[PDB]
Each structure stands twice: as C-alpha cells, then as structure tokens.
C-alpha cells in the first residue's frame, strides 16, 4: 500500500505537471486565437474594402 | 538430565544468536524495502512524467 501511495504522489506530481503543460499550450492557443480574431478583421479588411 | 540442560542452554544461546542473525537480515531487508519504495516513486517518475 505505501508503494501505492508513493506511486500515487509521484503521479499527482505528474498530474500537476500535466496541468501546467496543458495550460501552457492552452494559453498559447488563446493568444493564437486572439491573433486569428484580428486576422478575421483583416479578412474583412482584406475584403479590399470590397474593392 | 544435566546433559539435557547443558545442551539446552547452549541451544538457547544458539537460538539467541539466531534472533540476532534473523533480525540482522530482517532489518537489512527493511532498508532494501525503503529503497524499493523510493524506487517505485522513481518508476512513476521514470513514468517520464508520462512523456
């Protein structure tokens, strides 16, 4: 059992490391996303003002 | 009979020597075991933090 808790605790560390990783990528993707919103504005602007 | 007690007493000495031997090995095995617990933690850490 104490084996199970040692592996548990290290797996909770691995879980937390998970959370910070996934949140790193996630926040980066929200930054990309903010770009993409400005980009879409630059599509209706690259709408050529129509022409 | 006093033969039986002479052999008895020396056999109790041999028993006690037994206890200290078996406890020597035993305690050593509990130290090994403590390692193995840290090792298991180092398996979930050699879990590669997953990857």
Contact A6 B47 (CB under 8 A): no
Contact B47 A9 (CB under 8 A): no
Number of Cβ within a 10 Å radius of residue A7: 19
CB A3 within 8 A of CB B40: yes
Contact B36 A10 (CB under 8 A): no
Measured distance CA(A6)–CA(B38) in Å, rounded: 7
Tokens of A17: 């490391």
Tokens of B1: 């009979």
Of B37, B44, B49, the CB nearest to A2: B37
Contacts for B30-36 with beta carbons within 8 Å, 24 or more apart?
Answer: B36/A3
Q: Where are the alpha helices (DSSP H) in A1-51?
A: 2-45
Backbone angles phi, psi at B17, to 5 degrees: -50, -40
Of B40, B49, B50, the CB nearest to A7: B40
Number of Cβ within a 10 Å radius of residue A6: 20
DSSP code, position A29: H
Measured distance CA(A31)–CA(A43) in Å, rounded: 18
């Amino acid at each position: 059992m104490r084996g199970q808790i040692r592996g548990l605790e290290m797996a909770s560390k691995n879980s937390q490391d998970g959370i910070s990783l996934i949140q790193t990528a996630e926040g980066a993707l929200t930054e990309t996303h903010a770009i993409l919103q400005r980009v879409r504005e630059l599509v209706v602007q690259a709408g050529n003002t129509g022409t």
